[PDB]
Design a protein around this ligand. Structure first.
Ligand SMILES: Nc1ncnc2c1ncn2[C@@H]1O[C@H](COP(=O)(O)OP(=O)(O)NP(=O)(O)O)[C@@H](O)[C@H]1O
Ligand SMILES: Nc1ncnc2c1ncn2[C@@H]1O[C@H](COP(=O)(O)OP(=O)(O)NP(=O)(O)O)[C@@H](O)[C@H]1O
Ligand SMILES: [Ca+2]
Ligand SMILES: [Ca+2]
Ligand SMILES: [Mg+2]
Ligand SMILES: [Mg+2]
Lengths: 476, 476
């Protein structure tokens, strides 16, 4: 009596019949079970060799994976479905599953979701893309890893991303080990990545990248850790927030499928309606698949669907090559109508019910692993105008240019204050506000203030706060 | 007797004749003067409204521009050639120059180079792109500004970048005012920019962006200033290093032009060779321009040039529309040969002479403005193993889980040390190395060490250095 229930009935009564009639199962997807309506949300981790997928998961679980280890040059070569289970251990599952393993372990995260770990994308066994597309159809989130340490986008990869088409909304691109590269360089890599991806996925809507280094190791180059913890938090929120709304992603994928189904129905229908009854069959067919892009196109001319909805002409050509046309069924306006109406109105009403559900129970939310909150720790006019005239007395007794004291002179004086170099350098950096290399009266008074401050026994700030900036400070 | 000299003669004797014969001047570019061989290198600053072009220049010169002011909503509407001169002031210059102004001022930077400032690209007066292309042909560097504060890539802009085609090597993309946006957001914008640009310019080679805020104002959000000063330094080196090698960029642009010339020569030649002597002229022409892409293409079939070398078919169609075919000249293998040979062998020998020149005088280098060096300022096993057993005594007297002390307990103890919260929080952050939220024995000993340290009267580090990381530290 819930919403996924409603989705399921909608499917069974409105979609399934059309799929079965135009034999969707032998072209794109087999019919769905209850298992893909009533099962734990999956996240998929993909990327090329040594990008840290396994590490990433290890890190999400803050626990080691029974079957999967981690190493320098490529180690594991198959799909590991990291999922819940009462015992620690493993179990290895026309179709081929010997390239498929299953790991189980008592762990809350695995209560909330399950994480399927993939083989590394090469920088000739199966139809990797095809499987990525199958998962893409089924899965809740797709994590793509790039490592800022060895930026590479292989052909195979861009084929994979080609295969994730229509599901970009499920993609989280994470740029890993950003902590093992000097920052400028990071900028360089990030830039390259987004350029590349930009050209590759081709959508006008930009993918979010999460910048960090997903492992409990110390940070190599630490001067960016704020950003890393932040990005990590964002992604974690995104993952942790999955169980709360699977209904929505389900609904949505149902819509997408629907659209594809409708398209293909039209395709077969038209082919069948083009076929001659008894003789000529052969070449009317071969030619008919010679004229496929014409078909798709015209069908767009007179039906209103998006280039986004159509399958691949050539693959569809392979398969169409495999089928018998005379056996195809004809256009059936009834079932179609059922469809159009379904999505339109029925999904219309499911929306409101959905919202009402989308404020129900955060209990479903993913519980501690790398998610636990205790992991962040248990903890969390102008002042110199009084001494100005004095400072000025000094400053002007130091013979400045035209209001600006040379850097060298400033230094000799400063070092004259018998303070250690380091402190002084920091003070300089703090005081040279327009940062030209000299010190004018105000900047100088500031410097002096800071020197006195340190003399009293005061840690210096690391960034000059507004209240200390000479009043020629900043518009707002 | 120098290299630009040699270039000039090469041009005059090997290129000019071909241009003049196939009337290059009435299609792409007029013939060159000595003035574009013997003149001060230009840099061009472009971008859309309020991106800070004028500010950028102001900042490069560390001086205000006589004619050009700066404001909130769009202010200046023309081209300002900021160039050297003995007096401060201005002077306003079929062609139209009333959209052109000239400013002069005594200033070293203006001794080394001149900077042409442009109107803001709208987010119907002239052929903006065309002029950007003319400058692109002539100019040494092209600065494109985007502001991290209002990321927008207008149609007009992408038309401009479309117009910079073939000269991307001269492009420095700078993302301005990066200091007025929180860092994550910066990442977001940068990402967007590179995605967009990626899709727009279309080359497999990625453009460098320089991230900063080019003005002497204080920094809004300061926690990225290292990067900003760094990027600034890189760009400055790039600009400052121009006079040192104009010969190279000249040579190179000469090559590029050559290639274009050759192409177009072929085009006209073929058209003329297709034209019928006395009658039929009319439609053989109109049709001949109906079949232009066919021409270009076949000419690639049988001549070996790159899609990179060909003009725009449609524009060439407008102009071809303007010309008389019977007046065109025929293919002249001689002049062409002269060309091919020129670039090939002659440029071959110019290279070595060039290198010898490219180690001659850095004196030409741009002198102080924002370039002066004095602007950066006048300034620039494990230790706890001894007290370990003691610390451990405490740690284990605190009843930890299985080697890990809960965060709350750790806190009560720490706060027990009667240190201020802030310090303690910092210490925590420093000590929780695997950053899970508890403290194991080593991490705890570290914490203790740090606490004692602060008690003695010691500033805390801001980043735990390797020598202090418990020996389970980091692979290398
Ligand atoms: N965040 C990180 N920063 C730096 N190094 C890392 C990080 N994560 C993992 N590594 C190291 O980089 C390598 C990648 O390890 P791994 O986690 O196996 O990647 P992977 O994607 O599982 N490789 P594969 O499964 O063979 O495609 C290992 O040697 C790790 O020790
Ligand atoms: N680095 C910076 N950070 C923040 N704000 C800036 C920066 N540079 C300039 N501004 C402000 O942003 C606006 C842009 O000023 P301006 O230098 O005139 O840009 P512009 O590109 O010359 N505009 P236009 O010539 O009309 O296209 C002005 O109000 C400046 O005060
Ligand atoms: Ca100063
Ligand atoms: Ca810890
Ligand atoms: Mg692995
Ligand atoms: Mg301006």
């Amino acid at each position: 009596r819930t919403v996924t229930s409603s989705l399921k009935e909608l499917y069974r009564t409105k979609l399934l019949p059309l799929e079965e009639h135009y034999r969707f199962g032998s072209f794109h997807s087999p019919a769905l079970e209850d298992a893909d309506f009533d099962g734990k949300p999956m996240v998929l981790v993909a990327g090329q060799y040594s990008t840290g997928k396994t590490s990433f998961i290890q890190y999400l679980l803050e626990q080691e994976v029974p079957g999967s280890r981690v190493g320098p040059e490529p180690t594991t070569d198959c799909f590991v479905a990291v999922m819940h289970g009462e015992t620690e251990g493993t179990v290895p599952g026309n179709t081929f599953l010997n390239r498929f393993m299953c790991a189980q372990l008592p762990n809350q995260v695995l209560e909330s979701i399950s994480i399927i770990d993939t083989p590394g994308i090469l920088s000739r066994g199966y139809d990797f893309p095809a499987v990525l597309r199958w998962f893409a159809e089924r899965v809740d989130l797709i994590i793509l890893l790039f490592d800022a340490h060895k930026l590479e986008i292989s052909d195979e990869f861009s084929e994979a991303i080609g295969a994730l088409r229509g599901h970009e909304d499920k993609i989280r691109v994470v740029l890993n080990k950003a902590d093992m590269v000097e920052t400028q360089q990071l900028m360089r890599v990030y830039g390259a990545l987004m350029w590349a991806l930009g050209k590759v996925v081709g959508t006008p809507e930009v993918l979010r990248v999460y910048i960090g280094s997903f492992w409990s190791q110390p940070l190599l180059v630490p001067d960016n850790r704020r950003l890393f913890e932040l990005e990590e938090q964002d992604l974690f929120r995104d993952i942790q927030g999955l169980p709360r709304h699977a209904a929505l992603r389900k609904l949505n994928d149902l819509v997408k499928r629907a659209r594809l189904v409708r398209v293909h129905a039209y395709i077969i229908s038209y082919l069948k309606k083009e076929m001659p009854t008894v003789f000529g069959k052969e070449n009317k067919k071969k030619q008919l698949i010679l004229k496929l892009p014409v078909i798709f196109a015209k069908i767009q001319l007179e039906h209103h669907i998006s280039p986004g909805d159509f399958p691949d002409c050539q693959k569809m050509q392979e398969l169409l090559m495999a089928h018998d046309f005379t056996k195809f069924h004809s256009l059936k306006p009834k079932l179609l109508e059922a469809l159009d109406d379904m999505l339109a109105q029925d999904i219309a009403k499911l929306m409101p019910l959905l919202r009402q559900e989308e404020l129900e129970s955060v209990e479903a939310g993913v519980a501690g692993g790398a998610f636990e909150g205790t992991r962040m720790g248990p903890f969390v006019e102008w002042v110199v105008t009084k001494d100005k005239s004095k400072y000025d007395e000094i400053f002007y007794n130091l013979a400045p240019a035209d209001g600006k004291l040379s850097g060298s002179k400033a230094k000799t004086w400063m070092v004259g204050t018998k303070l250690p170099n380091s402190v002084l350098g920091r003070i300089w950096k703090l005081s040279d506000v327009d940062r030209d290399g000299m010190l004018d009266d105000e900047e100088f008074a500031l410097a002096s203030h800071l020197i006195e401050a340190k003399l009293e026994g005061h840690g210096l700030p690391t960034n000059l706060p507004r209240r200390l900036v000479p009043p020629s400070k900043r518009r707002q």
